[PDB]
């Protein structure tokens with residue numbers, strides 16, 4: 658590999674990696690709300706709506722499905738299934754917001770300047786921000802605008818998600834080595850898929866910087882959550898939302 662890159666060849670996926678790629682892609686497509694017809698099926702949140710009580714209410718009433726779809730995505734990855742229960746929980750809690758944010762970001766529309774949540778609710782920066790996210794909204798929107806020129810396909814989005822999922826640095830993990838090895842497997846297949854796609858200069862390095870940003874979005878959301886349960890009541894939070902962000 659290192660030798661091949663030296664010569665200047667950009668290795669494309671092996672047959673082994675194409676299998677992994679098909680698996681991850683299908684896992685994402687099956688659990689991606691509203692499939693590919695999301696634009697027609699989206700409804701714009703009334704300009705008047707939107708910590709703003711009602712805005713927060715709308716978002717939190719649909720976060721349960723969004724969350725379980727992330728779990729559904731992970732369940733369809735055999736590597737994820739090989740991990741012990743404790744690690745599975747830790748990986749899910751860790752990447753949940755990161756992946757949900759990605760899925761919202763990739764559905765940014767310059768025309769309306771909105772993101773689409775769960776493929777059905779189109780919101781502006783101001784609305785998402787006032788409904789509880791604060792600056793996390795700015796971060797997700799900036800990412801979305803930024804990603805439009807990356808022209809990511811379902812496979813690329815799927816692989817980003819898999820890389821986020823398999824983070825061996827989540828506190829409390831037991832299977833550090835194994836999870837890192839899983840991630841390396843995804844990263845390699847990812848880079849090979851990107852060579853095959855032939856996008857844009859320094860594409861791969863630029864994409865990896867997005868991984869870091871999604872990381873940040875997850876972390877700031879944790880802080881936002883602490884700010885929220887100081888304001889909003891506790892009864893305003895759905896049970897699964899509480900389980901994941903504790």
Ligand SMILES: N[C@@H](Cc1cc(I)c(Oc2ccc(O)c(I)c2)c(I)c1)C(=O)O
Nearest residue numbers: 716720723757758760761773774775789
């Ligand atoms: N759109 C995604 C899922 C998704 C659903 C929702 I509601 C989102 O807004 C949030 C998220 C966390 C919060 O604490 C609050 I308040 C609002 C986002 I960002 C993403 C998908 O397609 O799976």
